[PDB]
Amino acid sequence: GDPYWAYSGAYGPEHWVTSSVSCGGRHQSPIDILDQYARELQLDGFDNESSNKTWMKNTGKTVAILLKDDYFVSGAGLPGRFKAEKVEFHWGHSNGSAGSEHSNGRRFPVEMQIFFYNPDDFDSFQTAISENRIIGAMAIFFQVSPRDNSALDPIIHGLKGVVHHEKETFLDPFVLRDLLPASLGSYYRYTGSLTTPPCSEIVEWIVFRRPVPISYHQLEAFYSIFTTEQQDHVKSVEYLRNNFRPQQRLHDRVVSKS
Amino acid sequence: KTRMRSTVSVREGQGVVLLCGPPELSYAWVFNEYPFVEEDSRRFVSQETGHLYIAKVEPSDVGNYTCVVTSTVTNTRVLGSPTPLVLRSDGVMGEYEPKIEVQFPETLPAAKGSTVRLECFALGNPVPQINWRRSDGMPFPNKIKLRKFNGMLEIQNFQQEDTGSYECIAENSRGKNVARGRLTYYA
Protein backbone atom coordinates (compact mmCIF):
# COMPACT_ATOMS: atom_id res chain seq x y z
CA GLY A 1 0.00 0.00 0.00
CA ASP A 2 1.55 3.26 -1.22
CA PRO A 3 0.45 6.84 -0.45
CA TYR A 4 -1.28 8.65 -3.30
CA TRP A 5 0.78 11.56 -4.55
CA ALA A 6 1.01 13.92 -7.51
CA TYR A 7 2.91 16.91 -8.90
CA SER A 8 0.01 19.26 -8.14
CA GLY A 9 -3.07 19.78 -6.05
CA ALA A 10 -3.96 18.47 -2.60
CA TYR A 11 -1.25 15.84 -3.04
CA GLY A 12 1.34 17.98 -4.78
CA PRO A 13 4.98 18.13 -3.52
CA GLU A 14 4.29 20.58 -0.62
CA HIS A 15 1.83 18.04 0.74
CA TRP A 16 4.01 14.95 0.38
CA VAL A 17 5.39 15.47 3.84
CA THR A 18 1.97 14.91 5.37
CA SER A 19 1.72 11.33 4.01
CA SER A 20 5.45 10.57 3.58
CA VAL A 21 7.31 11.59 6.74
CA SER A 22 10.73 11.40 5.06
CA CYS A 23 9.74 14.08 2.53
CA GLY A 24 9.98 16.72 5.26
CA GLY A 25 13.61 16.22 6.22
CA ARG A 26 16.99 17.70 5.36
CA HIS A 27 19.37 16.33 2.71
CA GLN A 28 16.44 16.19 0.27
CA SER A 29 16.71 16.26 -3.53
CA PRO A 30 16.69 18.00 -5.88
CA ILE A 31 18.70 21.07 -5.02
CA ASP A 32 20.26 24.03 -6.74
CA ILE A 33 23.96 23.45 -7.29
CA LEU A 34 25.94 26.69 -7.03
CA ASP A 35 29.04 26.53 -9.22
CA GLN A 36 30.75 29.51 -7.56
CA TYR A 37 30.92 27.64 -4.24
CA ALA A 38 31.65 24.18 -5.70
CA ARG A 39 34.27 21.56 -4.64
CA GLU A 40 37.79 9.32 -11.35
CA LEU A 41 34.59 7.88 -12.98
CA GLN A 42 34.76 4.42 -14.64
CA LEU A 43 31.80 3.08 -16.68
CA ASP A 44 31.53 -0.63 -17.44
CA GLY A 45 29.24 -1.76 -20.27
CA PHE A 46 27.87 1.68 -21.23
CA ASP A 47 29.52 1.22 -24.62
CA ASN A 48 27.29 -1.76 -25.41
CA GLU A 49 24.11 -1.92 -27.46
CA SER A 50 21.14 -2.57 -25.18
CA SER A 51 19.07 -5.75 -25.29
CA ASN A 52 15.81 -6.11 -27.19
CA LYS A 53 14.50 -7.22 -23.78
CA THR A 54 15.19 -3.80 -22.30
CA TRP A 55 11.75 -2.18 -22.12
CA MET A 56 9.90 1.08 -21.32
CA LYS A 57 6.84 1.89 -19.17
CA ASN A 58 4.56 4.85 -18.59
CA THR A 59 4.14 4.84 -14.80
CA GLY A 60 1.81 7.81 -14.78
CA LYS A 61 4.44 9.81 -12.92
CA THR A 62 7.30 9.37 -15.36
CA VAL A 63 8.49 7.16 -18.18
CA ALA A 64 10.67 4.36 -16.85
CA ILE A 65 13.27 2.27 -18.66
CA LEU A 66 13.96 -1.12 -17.07
CA LEU A 67 17.52 -1.94 -18.05
CA LYS A 68 18.10 -5.64 -18.78
CA ASP A 69 21.86 -5.54 -19.44
CA ASP A 70 24.79 -5.12 -17.03
CA TYR A 71 25.96 -1.55 -16.58
CA PHE A 72 28.39 -0.47 -13.85
CA VAL A 73 29.79 2.76 -12.46
CA SER A 74 32.86 3.04 -10.27
CA GLY A 75 34.81 5.95 -8.81
CA ALA A 76 33.79 9.55 -8.14
CA GLY A 77 33.84 8.86 -4.41
CA LEU A 78 31.19 6.14 -4.46
CA PRO A 79 31.10 3.46 -1.71
CA GLY A 80 32.09 0.69 -4.14
CA ARG A 81 30.84 -0.34 -7.57
CA PHE A 82 27.23 0.31 -8.56
CA LYS A 83 25.03 -1.57 -11.07
CA ALA A 84 22.33 0.24 -13.07
CA GLU A 85 18.69 -0.67 -12.54
CA LYS A 86 16.42 1.78 -14.30
CA VAL A 87 16.13 5.13 -16.01
CA GLU A 88 13.42 7.78 -15.41
CA PHE A 89 12.73 11.18 -16.97
CA HIS A 90 11.46 14.63 -15.97
CA TRP A 91 10.14 17.18 -18.46
CA GLY A 92 8.38 20.53 -18.67
CA HIS A 93 5.26 21.74 -20.42
CA SER A 94 6.08 22.93 -23.93
CA ASN A 95 8.45 24.79 -26.24
CA GLY A 96 11.45 23.68 -24.18
CA SER A 97 9.80 24.68 -20.86
CA ALA A 98 11.95 23.96 -17.79
CA GLY A 99 11.27 20.51 -16.37
CA SER A 100 14.60 19.43 -14.91
CA GLU A 101 14.80 18.78 -11.18
CA HIS A 102 18.37 19.92 -10.41
CA SER A 103 19.86 23.18 -11.73
CA ASN A 104 22.69 26.86 -11.30
CA GLY A 105 19.22 28.35 -11.69
CA ARG A 106 19.47 27.48 -15.35
CA ARG A 107 16.98 24.66 -15.76
CA PHE A 108 16.75 22.42 -18.81
CA PRO A 109 13.76 21.03 -20.74
CA VAL A 110 14.50 17.47 -19.63
CA GLU A 111 16.48 15.78 -16.84
CA MET A 112 17.24 12.08 -16.99
CA GLN A 113 18.05 9.94 -13.96
CA ILE A 114 19.83 6.55 -13.92
CA PHE A 115 19.48 4.57 -10.68
CA PHE A 116 21.97 2.09 -9.29
CA TYR A 117 22.55 -0.28 -6.41
CA ASN A 118 25.59 -2.13 -5.06
CA PRO A 119 25.32 -5.82 -6.04
CA ASP A 120 28.41 -6.76 -4.04
CA ASP A 121 26.19 -6.63 -0.96
CA PHE A 122 22.70 -6.89 -2.50
CA ASP A 123 20.77 -9.08 -4.94
CA SER A 124 18.30 -6.65 -6.43
CA PHE A 125 17.54 -2.94 -6.47
CA GLN A 126 14.17 -3.52 -4.83
CA THR A 127 15.83 -5.25 -1.90
CA ALA A 128 18.11 -2.23 -1.46
CA ILE A 129 15.16 0.15 -1.35
CA SER A 130 13.22 -1.95 1.19
CA GLU A 131 16.29 -2.09 3.40
CA ASN A 132 17.02 1.68 3.25
CA ARG A 133 20.55 1.27 1.99
CA ILE A 134 22.66 3.54 -0.18
CA ILE A 135 21.90 3.76 -3.89
CA GLY A 136 23.56 5.77 -6.65
CA ALA A 137 21.92 8.11 -9.12
CA MET A 138 23.08 9.99 -12.16
CA ALA A 139 21.40 13.15 -13.38
CA ILE A 140 21.87 14.03 -17.00
CA PHE A 141 20.59 17.30 -18.46
CA PHE A 142 19.16 17.55 -21.95
CA GLN A 143 19.40 20.91 -23.72
CA VAL A 144 17.63 21.98 -26.90
CA SER A 145 19.57 21.87 -30.18
CA PRO A 146 18.95 22.83 -33.84
CA ARG A 147 19.41 19.24 -35.04
CA ASP A 148 18.03 15.87 -34.02
CA ASN A 149 20.06 13.52 -31.86
CA SER A 150 20.01 10.04 -33.40
CA ALA A 151 21.50 8.49 -30.27
CA LEU A 152 18.08 9.11 -28.76
CA ASP A 153 16.02 7.55 -31.58
CA PRO A 154 15.27 4.41 -29.60
CA ILE A 155 14.09 6.54 -26.62
CA ILE A 156 11.84 8.94 -28.56
CA HIS A 157 10.35 6.05 -30.53
CA GLY A 158 9.83 4.49 -27.13
CA LEU A 159 7.93 7.53 -25.90
CA LYS A 160 5.47 7.24 -28.79
CA GLY A 161 4.81 3.67 -27.73
CA VAL A 162 3.78 4.46 -24.13
CA VAL A 163 1.48 7.52 -24.41
CA HIS A 164 -0.98 6.32 -21.78
CA HIS A 165 -0.68 5.44 -18.10
CA GLU A 166 0.39 1.76 -17.66
CA LYS A 167 1.41 1.23 -21.28
CA GLU A 168 4.64 -0.70 -21.92
CA THR A 169 6.96 -1.44 -24.89
CA PHE A 170 10.35 -2.86 -25.83
CA LEU A 171 13.12 -0.59 -27.07
CA ASP A 172 15.32 -0.76 -30.12
CA PRO A 173 19.03 -1.09 -29.29
CA PHE A 174 20.55 2.06 -27.82
CA VAL A 175 23.90 2.94 -26.37
CA LEU A 176 23.62 4.17 -22.78
CA ARG A 177 26.95 5.99 -23.05
CA ASP A 178 25.57 8.30 -25.70
CA LEU A 179 22.69 9.11 -23.40
CA LEU A 180 25.42 10.87 -21.35
CA PRO A 181 27.15 14.21 -22.10
CA ALA A 182 29.90 14.38 -24.71
CA SER A 183 32.15 15.53 -21.88
CA LEU A 184 31.90 13.39 -18.74
CA GLY A 185 34.70 15.34 -17.09
CA SER A 186 32.76 18.11 -15.36
CA TYR A 187 30.20 16.88 -12.80
CA TYR A 188 29.15 17.33 -9.16
CA ARG A 189 28.56 15.16 -6.10
CA TYR A 190 26.38 15.28 -2.99
CA THR A 191 24.15 13.28 -0.62
CA GLY A 192 20.42 13.39 -1.22
CA SER A 193 17.20 11.46 -1.42
CA LEU A 194 14.63 10.13 -3.84
CA THR A 195 12.87 13.00 -5.61
CA THR A 196 9.59 11.14 -5.16
CA PRO A 197 7.82 9.70 -2.13
CA PRO A 198 8.89 8.15 0.11
CA CYS A 199 11.77 10.62 -0.43
CA SER A 200 14.08 8.12 1.29
CA GLU A 201 17.30 9.90 2.25
CA ILE A 202 19.59 7.22 0.87
CA VAL A 203 20.91 8.62 -2.42
CA GLU A 204 24.39 9.64 -3.64
CA TRP A 205 23.95 11.86 -6.68
CA ILE A 206 26.00 12.61 -9.77
CA VAL A 207 25.00 15.66 -11.80
CA PHE A 208 26.90 15.86 -15.07
CA ARG A 209 27.42 19.55 -15.78
CA ARG A 210 27.27 19.32 -19.57
CA PRO A 211 23.95 18.51 -21.30
CA VAL A 212 22.85 16.19 -24.11
CA PRO A 213 21.36 17.71 -27.26
CA ILE A 214 17.68 17.19 -28.24
CA SER A 215 15.54 18.81 -30.90
CA TYR A 216 12.27 20.63 -30.27
CA HIS A 217 10.82 17.87 -32.46
CA GLN A 218 12.22 15.02 -30.28
CA LEU A 219 11.20 17.11 -27.28
CA GLU A 220 7.55 16.88 -28.39
CA ALA A 221 7.27 13.16 -27.75
CA PHE A 222 7.64 14.04 -24.04
CA TYR A 223 4.79 16.49 -24.12
CA SER A 224 2.60 13.87 -25.78
CA ILE A 225 2.58 11.71 -22.68
CA PHE A 226 -0.59 11.27 -20.66
CA THR A 227 -1.41 10.09 -17.19
CA THR A 228 -4.44 9.68 -14.99
CA GLU A 229 -5.71 11.26 -11.79
CA GLN A 230 -7.76 9.40 -9.23
CA GLN A 231 -9.63 12.23 -7.53
CA ASP A 232 -12.75 11.50 -5.46
CA HIS A 233 -15.05 9.22 -7.51
CA VAL A 234 -13.78 10.51 -10.86
CA LYS A 235 -10.81 9.17 -12.78
CA SER A 236 -9.54 11.49 -15.52
CA VAL A 237 -7.01 11.48 -18.36
CA GLU A 238 -4.48 14.31 -18.05
CA TYR A 239 -1.28 15.50 -19.64
CA LEU A 240 1.78 14.25 -17.80
CA ARG A 241 3.81 17.45 -17.69
CA ASN A 242 6.00 19.43 -15.31
CA ASN A 243 6.67 16.27 -13.34
CA PHE A 244 9.53 17.69 -11.27
CA ARG A 245 9.94 18.21 -7.52
CA PRO A 246 10.69 21.74 -6.22
CA GLN A 247 14.34 22.29 -5.32
CA GLN A 248 15.10 21.61 -1.66
CA ARG A 249 17.43 23.27 0.83
CA LEU A 250 21.04 22.15 1.34
CA HIS A 251 21.32 22.75 5.12
CA ASP A 252 24.39 20.87 6.41
CA ARG A 253 25.55 19.85 2.91
CA VAL A 254 28.43 20.73 0.57
CA VAL A 255 28.85 19.89 -3.10
CA SER A 256 31.95 18.36 -4.65
CA LYS A 257 33.27 19.09 -8.14
CA SER A 258 35.40 17.12 -10.58
CA LYS B 1 -22.46 3.50 1.99
CA THR B 2 -23.47 7.19 2.26
CA ARG B 3 -20.69 9.71 1.59
CA MET B 4 -20.46 13.39 0.48
CA ARG B 5 -19.44 13.57 -3.21
CA SER B 6 -17.43 16.76 -3.80
CA THR B 7 -18.28 18.48 -7.09
CA VAL B 8 -15.65 17.51 -9.67
CA SER B 9 -14.54 19.90 -12.42
CA VAL B 10 -13.46 18.36 -15.75
CA ARG B 11 -12.25 19.62 -19.16
CA GLU B 12 -14.00 19.63 -22.52
CA GLY B 13 -12.51 16.87 -24.67
CA GLN B 14 -11.24 15.05 -21.57
CA GLY B 15 -11.69 11.30 -21.07
CA VAL B 16 -13.44 10.59 -17.78
CA VAL B 17 -14.68 7.71 -15.58
CA LEU B 18 -17.37 8.07 -12.92
CA LEU B 19 -16.81 5.35 -10.34
CA CYS B 20 -19.82 3.74 -8.70
CA GLY B 21 -18.43 2.28 -5.51
CA PRO B 22 -19.04 -1.44 -4.79
CA PRO B 23 -18.50 -4.57 -6.99
CA GLU B 24 -24.06 -10.33 -8.69
CA LEU B 25 -25.49 -6.86 -9.15
CA SER B 26 -26.70 -4.69 -12.05
CA TYR B 27 -25.76 -1.05 -12.62
CA ALA B 28 -27.35 2.01 -14.22
CA TRP B 29 -26.64 5.72 -14.21
CA VAL B 30 -29.26 8.42 -13.94
CA PHE B 31 -28.69 12.02 -14.84
CA ASN B 32 -29.88 14.94 -12.68
CA GLU B 33 -32.90 13.03 -11.37
CA TYR B 34 -34.54 9.62 -11.38
CA PRO B 35 -34.88 8.15 -13.87
CA PHE B 36 -30.90 7.33 -17.22
CA VAL B 37 -27.84 8.27 -19.22
CA GLU B 38 -28.20 7.93 -22.94
CA GLU B 39 -25.44 5.43 -23.73
CA ASP B 40 -23.84 5.57 -27.18
CA SER B 41 -20.35 5.56 -28.78
CA ARG B 42 -19.34 8.24 -26.29
CA ARG B 43 -20.77 6.84 -23.05
CA PHE B 44 -20.70 3.37 -21.66
CA VAL B 45 -21.87 1.68 -18.48
CA SER B 46 -19.99 -1.41 -17.30
CA GLN B 47 -21.77 -4.32 -15.67
CA GLU B 48 -18.36 -5.54 -14.60
CA THR B 49 -17.04 -2.50 -12.73
CA GLY B 50 -20.25 -0.55 -12.36
CA HIS B 51 -18.67 2.67 -13.58
CA LEU B 52 -19.77 5.14 -16.21
CA TYR B 53 -17.24 5.79 -18.97
CA ILE B 54 -17.36 9.12 -20.81
CA ALA B 55 -14.84 8.87 -23.69
CA LYS B 56 -14.89 12.60 -24.51
CA VAL B 57 -16.63 15.28 -22.45
CA GLU B 58 -19.13 17.47 -24.28
CA PRO B 59 -20.57 20.60 -22.66
CA SER B 60 -23.91 18.83 -22.56
CA ASP B 61 -22.55 16.40 -19.95
CA VAL B 62 -22.57 19.06 -17.20
CA GLY B 63 -24.91 17.87 -14.47
CA ASN B 64 -25.50 15.49 -11.59
CA TYR B 65 -24.54 11.84 -11.99
CA THR B 66 -25.69 9.18 -9.57
CA CYS B 67 -25.22 5.42 -9.70
CA VAL B 68 -28.12 3.08 -8.98
CA VAL B 69 -27.10 -0.46 -8.10
CA THR B 70 -29.73 -3.24 -8.15
CA SER B 71 -29.37 -6.61 -6.38
CA THR B 72 -30.11 -9.66 -8.56
CA VAL B 73 -31.46 -11.29 -5.38
CA THR B 74 -34.38 -8.88 -5.55
CA ASN B 75 -35.64 -5.75 -7.35
CA THR B 76 -34.07 -3.45 -4.75
CA ARG B 77 -32.30 -0.37 -6.08
CA VAL B 78 -29.92 1.53 -3.82
CA LEU B 79 -28.95 4.98 -5.10
CA GLY B 80 -25.68 6.74 -4.47
CA SER B 81 -25.29 10.46 -3.72
CA PRO B 82 -24.85 12.15 -7.11
CA THR B 83 -21.59 13.54 -8.41
CA PRO B 84 -22.14 16.95 -9.93
CA LEU B 85 -19.65 17.78 -12.66
CA VAL B 86 -18.82 21.04 -14.43
CA LEU B 87 -16.52 22.42 -17.10
CA ARG B 88 -13.18 24.16 -16.67
CA SER B 89 -12.75 27.48 -18.49
CA ASP B 90 -8.97 27.42 -18.42
CA GLY B 91 -8.56 25.22 -21.48
CA VAL B 92 -9.90 22.52 -23.78
CA MET B 93 -8.08 19.18 -23.85
CA GLY B 94 -6.69 18.17 -27.23
CA GLU B 95 -6.78 14.98 -29.31
CA TYR B 96 -4.97 11.77 -28.25
CA GLU B 97 -4.79 7.96 -28.75
CA PRO B 98 -7.57 5.80 -27.39
CA LYS B 99 -6.97 4.39 -23.94
CA ILE B 100 -8.87 1.19 -23.21
CA GLU B 101 -10.17 1.82 -19.69
CA VAL B 102 -12.32 -1.26 -19.08
CA GLN B 103 -11.83 -4.66 -20.74
CA PHE B 104 -12.30 -8.42 -20.47
CA PRO B 105 -9.65 -10.40 -18.54
CA GLU B 106 -6.43 -11.78 -20.00
CA THR B 107 -7.93 -15.19 -19.52
CA LEU B 108 -11.60 -15.95 -19.09
CA PRO B 109 -13.07 -19.35 -18.23
CA ALA B 110 -16.64 -19.89 -19.45
CA ALA B 111 -19.14 -22.62 -18.55
CA LYS B 112 -20.62 -24.69 -21.38
CA GLY B 113 -23.62 -23.08 -22.98
CA SER B 114 -23.29 -20.00 -20.81
CA THR B 115 -23.42 -16.54 -22.36
CA VAL B 116 -20.18 -14.62 -22.20
CA ARG B 117 -20.06 -10.87 -22.60
CA LEU B 118 -16.69 -9.32 -23.35
CA GLU B 119 -16.51 -5.61 -22.48
CA CYS B 120 -14.19 -3.16 -24.22
CA PHE B 121 -14.37 0.63 -23.94
CA ALA B 122 -11.83 3.39 -24.42
CA LEU B 123 -11.39 7.04 -23.60
CA GLY B 124 -10.22 9.05 -26.57
CA ASN B 125 -10.55 12.27 -28.48
CA PRO B 126 -11.85 11.84 -31.11
CA VAL B 127 -14.25 9.22 -29.78
CA PRO B 128 -12.68 5.80 -30.36
CA GLN B 129 -14.29 3.18 -32.58
CA ILE B 130 -14.27 -0.38 -31.25
CA ASN B 131 -13.62 -3.36 -33.53
CA TRP B 132 -13.51 -7.05 -32.64
CA ARG B 133 -11.74 -10.06 -34.19
CA ARG B 134 -10.10 -13.40 -33.41
CA SER B 135 -6.35 -13.63 -33.12
CA ASP B 136 -6.09 -16.69 -35.39
CA GLY B 137 -7.82 -14.80 -38.22
CA MET B 138 -10.88 -17.03 -38.26
CA PRO B 139 -14.12 -15.06 -38.63
CA PHE B 140 -16.75 -15.19 -35.84
CA PRO B 141 -19.59 -17.71 -36.09
CA ASN B 142 -23.04 -16.20 -36.63
CA LYS B 143 -24.13 -16.46 -32.96
CA ILE B 144 -21.71 -13.71 -31.93
CA LYS B 145 -23.08 -10.17 -31.89
CA LEU B 146 -21.92 -6.64 -31.20
CA ARG B 147 -23.89 -5.17 -28.34
CA LYS B 148 -23.65 -1.81 -26.55
CA PHE B 149 -22.42 0.20 -29.58
CA ASN B 150 -19.51 -2.24 -30.17
CA GLY B 151 -18.43 -1.88 -26.56
CA MET B 152 -19.52 -5.45 -25.81
CA LEU B 153 -19.06 -8.80 -27.56
CA GLU B 154 -21.73 -11.39 -26.80
CA ILE B 155 -21.18 -15.10 -27.26
CA GLN B 156 -24.29 -17.07 -26.47
CA ASN B 157 -24.25 -20.84 -26.05
CA PHE B 158 -20.55 -20.98 -25.30
CA GLN B 159 -19.01 -24.18 -26.66
CA GLN B 160 -15.47 -25.55 -27.04
CA GLU B 161 -15.30 -24.33 -30.66
CA ASP B 162 -15.64 -20.78 -29.26
CA THR B 163 -12.41 -20.96 -27.29
CA GLY B 164 -9.35 -19.03 -28.42
CA SER B 165 -7.87 -15.54 -28.33
CA TYR B 166 -10.19 -12.55 -28.77
CA GLU B 167 -8.89 -9.07 -29.66
CA CYS B 168 -10.51 -5.74 -29.11
CA ILE B 169 -9.21 -2.80 -31.16
CA ALA B 170 -9.96 0.85 -30.31
CA GLU B 171 -8.90 3.65 -32.62
CA ASN B 172 -9.26 7.19 -33.70
CA SER B 173 -7.23 9.49 -35.95
CA ARG B 174 -4.44 9.64 -33.35
CA GLY B 175 -3.62 5.92 -33.05
CA LYS B 176 -4.93 2.54 -31.88
CA ASN B 177 -4.64 0.33 -28.82
CA VAL B 178 -5.55 -3.29 -28.29
CA ALA B 179 -7.05 -5.54 -25.63
CA ARG B 180 -6.38 -9.26 -25.87
CA GLY B 181 -7.52 -12.27 -23.89
CA ARG B 182 -8.01 -15.99 -24.25
CA LEU B 183 -11.44 -17.48 -23.67
CA THR B 184 -11.48 -21.00 -22.26
CA TYR B 185 -14.18 -23.69 -21.93
CA TYR B 186 -15.37 -25.95 -19.13
CA ALA B 187 -18.45 -28.10 -18.47
From Swiss-Prot, chain A:
- In what tissue types does this protein appear? Found in a variety of tissues.
Where does the UniProt entry place glycosylation sites?
N48, N52, N95
Disulphide bridges? C23-C199
Q: Which residues form the Alpha-carbonic anhydrase domain?
A: 3-258
Protein localization: Membrane
User: Out of the domains of life, which is the source?
Assistant: Eukaryota
Function per UniProt: Possesses tyrosine phosphatase activity.
* Subunit: Monomer; active form. Homodimer; inactive form. Interacts with CNTN3, CNTN4, CNTN5 and CNTN6.
What the record says about family reads: Belongs to the protein-tyrosine phosphatase family. Receptor class 5 subfamily.
Indicate what this protein is called per its UniProt record. Receptor-type tyrosine-protein phosphatase gamma
The shown residues of the full protein are 56 to 320 of 1445
UniProtKB/Swiss-Prot annotation, chain B:
The cysteines covalently paired via disulfide bonds are: C20-C67, C120-C168
Residue positions the entry lists as glycosylated: N64
Residue runs in coiled coils: none
Q: Which residues form the Ig-like C2-type domain?
A: 1-80, 98-184
Question: Where does the entry say this protein is expressed, by tissue?
Answer: Specifically expressed in brain. Ectopically expressed in tumors expressing endogenous intracisternal A-type particles (IAPs).
The subcellular localization recorded is:
Cell membrane
The entry's family comment says:
Belongs to the immunoglobulin superfamily. Contactin family.
Q: What quaternary arrangement does the UniProt entry report?
A: Interacts with PTPRG.
Its biological purpose is as follows: Contactins mediate cell surface interactions during nervous system development. Has some neurite outgrowth-promoting activity.
> Any idea what this protein is called?
Contactin-3
- Please report the organism this UniProt entry assigns to the protein: Mus musculus (Mouse)
Q: Which gene encodes it?
A: Cntn3
Q: Which residues of the full protein are shown?
A: 125 to 316 of 1028
